[PDB]
Amino acid sequence: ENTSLWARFCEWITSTENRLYIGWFGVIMIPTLLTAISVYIIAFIAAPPVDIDGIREPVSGSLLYGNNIITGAVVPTSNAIGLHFYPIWEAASLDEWLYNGGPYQLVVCHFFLGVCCYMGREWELSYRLGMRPWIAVAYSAPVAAATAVFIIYPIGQGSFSDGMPLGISGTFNFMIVFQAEHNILMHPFHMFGVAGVFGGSLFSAMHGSLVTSSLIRETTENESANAGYKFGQEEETYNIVAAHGYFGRLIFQYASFNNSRSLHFFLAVWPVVCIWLTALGISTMAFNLNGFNFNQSVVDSNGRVLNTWADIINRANLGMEVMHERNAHNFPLDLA
Amino acid sequence: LVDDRMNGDGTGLPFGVNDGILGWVIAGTLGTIWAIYFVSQKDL
Amino acid sequence: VNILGLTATALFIIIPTSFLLILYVKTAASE
Amino acid sequence: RAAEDPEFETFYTKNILLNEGIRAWMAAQDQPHEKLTLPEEVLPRGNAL
Amino acid sequence: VLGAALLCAIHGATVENTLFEDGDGANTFRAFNPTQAEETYSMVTANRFW
Amino acid sequence: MTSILQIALLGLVLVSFALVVGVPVVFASPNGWTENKGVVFSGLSVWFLLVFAVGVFNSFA
Amino acid sequence: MEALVYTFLLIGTLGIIFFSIFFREPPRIA
Amino acid sequence: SLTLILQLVALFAVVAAGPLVVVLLSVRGGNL
Amino acid sequence: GRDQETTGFAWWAGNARLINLSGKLLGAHVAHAGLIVFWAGAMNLFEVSHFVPEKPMYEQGLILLPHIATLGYGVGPGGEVLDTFPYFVSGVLHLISSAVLGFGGVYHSLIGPETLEESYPFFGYVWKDKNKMTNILGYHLIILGCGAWLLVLKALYFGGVYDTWAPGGGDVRIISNPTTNAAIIFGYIVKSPFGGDGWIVSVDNLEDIIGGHIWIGTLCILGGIWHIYTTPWPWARRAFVWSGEAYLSYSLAAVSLMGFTACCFAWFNNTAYPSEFYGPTGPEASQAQAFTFLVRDQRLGANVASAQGPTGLGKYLMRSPTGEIIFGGETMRFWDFRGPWVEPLRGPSGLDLVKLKNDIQPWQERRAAEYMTHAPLGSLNSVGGVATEINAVNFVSPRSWLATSHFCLGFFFFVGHLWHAGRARAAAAGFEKGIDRVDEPVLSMRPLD
Amino acid sequence: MLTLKIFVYTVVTFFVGLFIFGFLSNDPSRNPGKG
Amino acid sequence: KLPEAYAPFSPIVDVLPIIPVLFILLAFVWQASVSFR
Amino acid sequence: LTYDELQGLTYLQVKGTGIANTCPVVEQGTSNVRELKPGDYKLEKFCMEPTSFTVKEEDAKGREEFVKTKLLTRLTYGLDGMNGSMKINNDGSVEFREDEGLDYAATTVKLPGGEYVPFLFTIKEFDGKGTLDSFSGDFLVPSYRGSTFLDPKGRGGATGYDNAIALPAKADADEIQRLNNKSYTPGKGSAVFSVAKVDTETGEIAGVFESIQPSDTEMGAHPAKDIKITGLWYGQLT
Ligand code: CLA
Ligand code: CLA
Ligand code: CLA
Ligand code: CLA
Ligand code: CLA
Ligand SMILES: CCCCCCCCCCCCCCCCCC(=O)OC[C@H](CO)OC(=O)CCCCCCCCCCCCCCCCC
Ligand SMILES: CC1=C(/C=C/C(C)=C/C=C/C(C)=C/C=C/C=C(C)/C=C/C=C(C)/C=C/C2=C(C)CCCC2(C)C)C(C)(C)CCC1
Ligand SMILES: CC1=C(/C=C/C(C)=C/C=CC(/C)=C/C=C/C=C(C)/C=C/C=C(C)/C=C/C2=C(C)CCCC2(C)C)C(C)(C)CCC1
Ligand SMILES: [Cl-]
Ligand SMILES: [Cl-]
Ligand SMILES: [Fe+2]
Ligand code: NA
User: Fold this and answer.
1) Which GO terms describe its biological process (chain G) (predicted)?
2) Among L205, L195, L193, L201, which Cα is nearest to L237's?
3) Which residue's CA is the nearest one to ligand 5's atom 1?
4) A with G: 3 or more CB pairs under 8 Å?
5) In angstroms, rounded to a whole number, what is the distance separating the alpha carbons of residues L33 and L68?
6) Residue among D4, E33, I350, I265 nearest A244 (CA)
7) If you count residue pairs, one on A and one on I, with CB atoms under 8 Å apart, how many are there?
8) For residue I219, what are the contacts with CB-CB under 8 A and spacing of at least 6?
9) Are I78 and I170 in contact (CB under 8 A)?
10) What are the two backbone dihedrals, phi and then psi, of residue I34, each rounded to the nearest 5 degrees?
11) Could you give the CA distance from residue I29 to residue K21 in angstroms, rounded to a whole number?
12) Is L70 in Cβ contact with A92 (below 8 Å)?
């Protein structure tokens, strides 16, 4: 009947006429994401130096402390806190909240909730638009990777100080320390993931080139070929069967996608399932399952070890390992 | 002690409630949202 | 490189933005 | 700035140290033509480990 | 490379979640016949959604 | 007594192999289930007899 | 002094994103 | 090794038994 | 079976063809339960064939024998295995039971009735009969409540369960007077999952474990009776979806939750997953290395209360952020670890210096050394140690394997829940096949998006 | 400092309750399609 | 090791874990045999 | 909270509350102080909890003063379980000697302006001479970082490069106090201990304490700062 206050608020929230859809997953996604955005921007601008390692030496991380855009990074929570929940209200003051790594753990918790509700909001808008609902499933792969690097790896290793720092050189630091400790390069799940981005780029170039190579002539040479398409037209704007013929006599006549829906399913599923596999690889290496270990596999008849490519990889790994936490180790085994 | 803290880390408090005012405001906010949701019913 | 870098970045902001603004204002003038 | 301030480290300086560790621990076995018979006391490391 | 893998996944997902019916069957792959002059998916619905 | 246990268990092994290769074959055979009722009944019966026999002989062996 | 320029460049990109979202050329649907 | 030979005969007997069921159902009438 | 023409479902979605075929659906389920029981029995027999008694069970790649030994079968004081026969019994019983279940599944899948409502109306159901579906749900809650009370009976009257907190280093114990206090039981449930709290992973005594099982068994039986004797209320009807795919999606979300929590139990918990059987936990190994080197550097004539590290924060002992005395080094991140060989050495201020000096025990120090050498770090070739080590130790912890695989399964099952929640919603809505192409909702809305 | 915790608890509880009762308010009936 | 009565049955114990993987592969075999209808 | 009921509480009842960082408070006994029996004593479990942290600064108009700080670290500031032996005389003269225990605790504070002040709050090697109302003495203050500490550019005394290798041409002249010379010189402190609320029945003492000690000198990069620490203390005799 549409008179009540909850009715007005509810139809406003589920309204598909808003410039940006809000929805019920949006009533969580919007405040969590603005919280994470505000804290991330303020921390990237002027966060005081954060003690990542727990050993009374901080990493600066903020632009106002002499960092450029490549170096600047929201530094993770302290190693002393571990997986303990560390809100602002739990800290004695904002200043030591900052020094122990509070902004990071805040931004990561809000980013988790924001991407989860972004996925829910994607499903919701597809439901309200009569769509099919699996764009949320396709988006679950970058969400899986984000959870794997920001929360699942800290749970497996025992501290948010092992999470990815929110920055560029901090990300590179995470990758190098991670390979040093777990050998991600020789992990089959990371191999599938690398194949996923390489394939996503390959089939993106392939799909774009085959569609652009078959666009039907509608405009003149002095106009953009894009002007041959008008938004909302029902005609097919390219020659799908001709692109099939070209692809077939280029690679395999019979092993070519003769269905456009098959082609788009492969386009959707290949990088998504591979990012699922690499996100799960990061999760497996959170619980220390690690990559392939072929260090001193090959030996001669005398039993003397022959170095191999995996052994050169291992020497690089020892180089990476003896530099991460240059002063935080008291014991030889890296069980932390 | 050199300062004052809420010192509620650990100890496993229900919903992280260290003073009962937090539980009362959780109860109040869910209760009033349920109240508006209930008075605005018999609709659609 | 503290002020030479600033003038390099300043010119990189201005010249392509100005060229793009030429072209866009020219387009939007003609409907 | 890091050279003139013994307290200023960033993830950038951490990456530089990691890179140097890679170079010194990788060179002897990766570039055998250089015959780098480096003693283990000059290889840069962290603590313990 | 990351944006291209994103483009691959997001384009495939968008096309297959904006498909037109042409159905009478729960499998959608058999609703496509490649000698037709009509689009299979709603570019309008996709544009509105994104 | 362990010899009887091994003989009965090996018999159970062959009987279970015959059930594996035969029960789906008999069931999905076109109108073969009705005239193989005696065979399936005897096979399951001797299978259970062997199971409980091996179970008892485990106590004596 | 470099930090001023970095903040300018970053919020400039943010302003470009704001304008490209809320001040776009609408789809004409004709 | 006797144990190895029994392991391989058990493996071959099991691996054959599945497609043996399918082949016997394919040649013995149908309803598969 | 059916084909694409008669159902619209391709072969790679063939099980959807049996969504509305109750008898074949039942057959698929019974055959599947036959597979689960079959794997349990077959892998149990494989493990007891490949079990070795002079080694602990975490060194031989075992995942089911630790589970049986936690119930108090074949192990005595110290967690030492005394009889592999109970494990043999469980394996063979499961294998025979799987034969029976597999016959039931094959029968009901191949020659069983196609739909059960025309001949057996008690088992006959359609996905919209909410009364019948809640009856089935109620029957299954009584079944699961009897399972939980079966564990309660095992702990109370049938030999007890293995207690790693028993004095001396762990022993099987008859649980007497399990905690029945609702405050204590549900405080675990409403607890935060972060450090020091850990949600319900931080359950640390079989008293709490068995009491929660009494509690959950009684709730399951009561809710089962309630579901048999009720129907969902109109708010539940207006909020939920009532398709079989929807019920599947609800189950998928719940079991994905269960898989994630199982991963965290296997990784952190040491009272339901004793380290004598599963190997040390992640915190356990690092705290063990710190504790061992602490006692060696007491034996080499040095004061550990003093002697700050290269950062001046303490080589062996330091202060946690909450004020107690903890082990120094990076293992400070695991300062909230609780195990049977640290609690007798822990005072109100955390670790007590005089107790660390005088009240050491030989069993604690060898347990700590063995946990130090067998840390849950290994490669997927089963090469123990960090990724920079040598192929010399063939060991990966069962905690690692279980937490790894069950996080993978919990994540993929969450994704399956996404897929099925979406497909159930769009199927109840009507556009599971696509847009109408003539009544497209997007063309009926205002411009400017 | 406790005040900030009380206010944030109010914020989170309010938004979570809004989410919960928004989905409880007959969401599977807000499809655009027939039925 | 299995009890002293069941020691010669260890080889046919050793192959039993892989049987569910054989079951999913058998489902694919049957679908290939019915021509993937 | 006394030593009695603190030991009556288990580890699970104290964890996460901050009771473990707080020295025992005595309510029994008399504040008469002088009624302790004189003689040679051997104290065990010397405990000291600070209640204030202030740092001497340089005001730009020319003033020298201590201004309050904000504690960067969490509850890691007290010292507990320190042994020793003292001599108390009938005329009131005491000496104080501390030998073992957790006799140091690293602590970082902010001066207003967001400058980090790390220091190693120690009481080690304390030899305080005086009366029972107040006795004062000197204590050893170690540097902060050990010789094996590596700075951001490597370096350090035992382990390190001793030169900025990050630029292959500038490795001499002005940066002597950054790379060419590293200093781990231990400092010296000054503390004034007062005794109040003595329990002579069970042989325990308490009161307040005062201390001035150097902050982190680090490697010679900056001049050290001087920290004025006030707080309570506790000690059991025999
Ligand atoms: C847990 C695995 C599992 C289970 C229990 C089932 C069960 C079922 N499927 Mg299915 N399927 C599966 C996996 C599974 N499937 C997978 C992975 C795929 C993708 C390849 C398919 C694709 C698929 C399709 C396309 C179809 C089914 C169909 C069916 C149903 C009838 C099959 C039939 O009668 O046709 C005949 C099958 C046979 C004659 C083969 C007989 C072989 C038997 C069953 C193997 C067991 C033998 C065993 C070793 C002996 C044990 C007996 C005793 C000793 C214990 C049935 C309930 C059909 C259906 O929907 O029904 C309407 C159908 O159309 N499935
Ligand atoms: C998920 C539960 C689970 C867990 C935690 C374990 C854990 C373990 N198993 Mg076990 N097992 C399981 C299930 C499980 N298993 C199942 C279902 C079977 C039946 C096939 C077996 C059969 C089995 C045997 C026969 C043996 C073990 C053994 C072991 C131990 C060593 C594992 C190893 O090193 O192998 C290697 C690790 C792998 C092979 C990981 C493979 C990675 C995934 C699974 C495959 C890749 C997927 C691909 C990329 C995606 C494709 C998608 C699509 C196209 C299909 C270890 C403790 C061994 C043991 O120690 O005995 C005591 C052993 O002999 N398992
Ligand atoms: C896993 C078994 C199971 C399942 C599948 C169900 C399923 C269902 N139950 Mg049910 N129930 C169960 C066990 C189960 N119940 C048991 C064991 C009991 C005995 C205690 C009950 C007692 C019960 C009652 C009294 C009612 C239901 C009702 C319902 C229906 C609607 C519930 C709902 O709205 O969803 C989800 C519910 C909510 C989102 C609101 C519940 C409030 C919270 C979530 C309860 C948990 C409290 C806890 C603090 C929350 C945080 C826990 C988390 C941190 C782990 C639904 C079909 C209702 C019904 O329709 O009657 C027929 C109803 O009246 N059940
Ligand atoms: C490849 C498939 C696969 C395999 C091989 C396994 C294997 C395993 N899983 Mg698992 N799981 C899987 C898939 C798989 N899972 C999937 C897809 C999910 C959803 C994401 C899960 C979710 C899951 C959870 C939540 C848990 C496991 C657990 C386990 C382990 C113990 C199994 C168990 O005892 O369960 C339970 C057995 C039953 C439910 C049957 C009832 C048994 C009765 C009630 C026992 C009563 C006996 C009583 C105590 C004795 C007294 C007798 C008398 C004297 C009274 C085991 C190694 C457990 C674990 O160890 O966590 C790591 C566990 O908690 N899994
Ligand atoms: C109890 C859980 C459960 C149940 C009952 C179902 C049931 C159903 N699903 Mg489903 N699904 C689930 C979980 C479940 N799913 C999970 C966890 C996922 C992962 C995201 C999916 C993803 C999925 C998709 C994409 C589809 C279904 C579909 C279907 C329907 C037809 C299934 C079929 O015949 O496919 C045939 C069986 C096969 C093709 C065999 C699959 C082979 C897999 C890929 C190999 C995996 C093995 C490998 C070793 C796993 C390792 C992973 C990692 C842990 C190492 C059916 C009603 C279809 C549908 O919606 O129909 C309406 C369909 O499109 N499901
Ligand atoms: C941290 C402390 C709080 C923790 C709360 C945990 C205990 C409660 C958890 C179980 C709640 C039962 C859920 C079933 C109803 C939810 C679905 C619904 O929407 O049910 C819909 C249904 C439609 O009739 O409603 C009904 O059946 C009516 C049944 C629900 C009645 C709710 C009353 C609870 C008391 C709160 C009201 C105070 C109200 C106003 C506050 C004013 C403040 C100024
Ligand atoms: C439906 C279907 C299907 C199927 C499924 C299933 C699942 C089945 C099954 C089944 C089953 C699940 C079965 C089982 C079985 C069992 C048996 C057959 C047994 C036995 C026994 C024995 C003989 C043993 C012996 C022994 C002992 C006692 C001890 C020592 C050792 C030994 C081994 C000697 C498929 C998928 C294909 C496809 C689709 C359709
Ligand atoms: C045994 C044991 C124990 C116990 C346990 C327990 C007792 C548990 C429980 C629990 C519980 C008691 C739970 C509950 C729950 C619930 C849930 C989990 C839910 C849900 C759902 C959802 C998610 C929803 C959604 C929605 C909404 C929001 C509304 C309606 C509609 C919809 C659907 C939309 C302990 C730990 C002590 C110890 C150890 C062992
Ligand atoms: Cl590093
Ligand atoms: Cl360490
Ligand atoms: Fe396309
Ligand atoms: Na180091």
Assistant:
1) photosynthesis
2) L205
3) I252
4) yes
5) 31
6) E33
7) 223
8) I145
9) yes
10) -60, -40
11) 17
12) yes
Q: Rounded to 5 degrees, what are φ and ψ at L132?
A: -80, -30
Domain with residue A139: its CATH number is 1.20.85.10
Task: For residue I343, say whether it is annotated as part of any ligand binding site.
Answer: yes
Q: Per 3-state DSSP, what percentage of chain J is helix, strand, and coil (rounded to 5)?
A: 75, 0, 25
Dist CA L82 CA L122 (whole Å): 11
Exposure class string for I158-195: b at 16+ Cβ within 10 A, else e: eebbbbbbbeebbbbbebeebbeeeeebebbeebbebb
Which sign does the torsion angle of CA I233, I237, I242, I246 carry? Answer: negative
Closest CA to L12 of I205, I70, A82: I205
On whether the CB atoms of residues I31 and I109 are closer than 8 A, the answer is yes
- At D44, list the tokens: 């840069």
Count of Cβ atoms closer than 10 Å to residue L98 Cβ: 24
Cα distances from L77 to residues I314, L14, L231, in angstroms, run 13, 17, 11
Return all residues near I257 (Cβ < 8 A) that are at least 6 apart: I410
**Distance from the Cα of residue J16 to its chain's centroid:** 4
| L203 touches L227 (CB < 8 A) | no
The alpha-carbon radius of gyration of chain F (Å, integer) is 14
**Distance between CA atoms of residues E14 and E31, nearest Å:** 17
Residues in chain A: 336
d(CA I74, CA I83): 4
Q: From E22, L180, J18, select the one nearest I434 (Cα to Cα).
A: E22
- Mutation target for A interface from D1, D7, D9, D10: give the one with most A CBs within 10 A: D10
Closest CA to I395 of I408, I407, I380: I380
Q: Which of E47, J33, A128 is nearest to I439 (CA)?
A: J33
List, in sequence order, every beta strand (DSSP E) within chain L. 39-41, 43-58, 64-68, 70-71, 79-82, 85-88, 93-97, 104-111, 115-122, 127-131, 135-141, 187-195, 204-214, 226-237
Identity of residue I276: E
Question: What whole-number distance in Å separates Cα of residue J35 and Cα of residue K6?
Answer: 63
Chains that touch A (3 or more CB pairs under 8 A): B, D, E, G, I, J, L
**How many domains, in total, are found in chain B?**
1
Spatial CA neighbour of A102 closest among A126, A71, A74, A67 = A74
I106 at F interface, C-beta within 8 A: yes
Of residues J2, J5, J13, nearest to B29 (C-beta): J13
- List strand residue ranges (DSSP E) for chain A, in order: 73-74, 166-167
Contact between I80 and I52 under an 8 Å Cβ cutoff? The reply is no
Query: In which domain, by residue range, is A50 found?
Result: 5-186
Torsion of CA H9, I50, I388, D15, to 10 degrees: 90
L191 within 8 A of L209, measured Cβ to Cβ = yes
CB I394 within 8 A of CB I378: no
Dihedral sign for Cα atoms in the order F23, F29, F34, F38:
negative
Q: Which of I389, A315, A319 is nearest to D43 (CA)?
A: A319
Residues followed by a gap in chain C, C→N > 2.5 Å: none
Q: Where are chain F's structural domains?
A: 1-61
CA-wise closest residue to A89 among A102, A79, A78, A80: A102
